[PDB]
């Protein structure tokens, strides 16, 4: 509550998902060389979202009412299927994605709009590139 900072006020870069810019090559999500990446999305689907597009019509895991999954279960910010993030995006539901952590490789099966639509909670870090 009391005062709080919008997305039109100021800043929208990355570094290091913390104030501190630590090169071990982690929250700057730079692995594409200009633009053209080749498969990297980090995003984060919730297991609500998981088990209702599982039972709509295809087993996001396997047909099992065991937790087994070939790969990529809920909650894996890391190599995330684009596909699976934006067909529940499509189905009208959605969780909330880093736009921090997905790269620009991610636009070419989803899109920029599907992101910033439902965003993460935006905190603000402190820039000390200034």
Do not use: I
């Amino acid at each position: 509550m009391g005062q709080g900072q919008n997305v039109l006020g100021q800043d929208l870069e990355v570094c290091c998902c913390a104030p501190m810019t630590g090169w071990y090559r982690n929250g700057f999500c730079q692995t594409d060389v200009q633009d053209r990446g080749s498969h990297t999305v980090c995003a984060e689907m919730t297991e609500e979202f998981l088990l209702f597009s599982r039972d709509r019509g295809n087993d996001l895991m396997t047909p099992r009412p065991e937790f087994n999954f070939p790969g990529l279960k809920a909650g894996d910010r890391w190599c995330l299927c684009a596909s699976r993030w934006q067909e529940a995006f499509e189905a009208g539901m959605a969780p909330p994605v880093v736009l921090q952590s997905t790269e620009k490789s991610a636009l070419r099966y989803v899109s920029l709009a599907d992101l910033q639509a439902h965003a993460l909670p935006v905190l603000e870090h402190h820039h000390h590139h200034h």
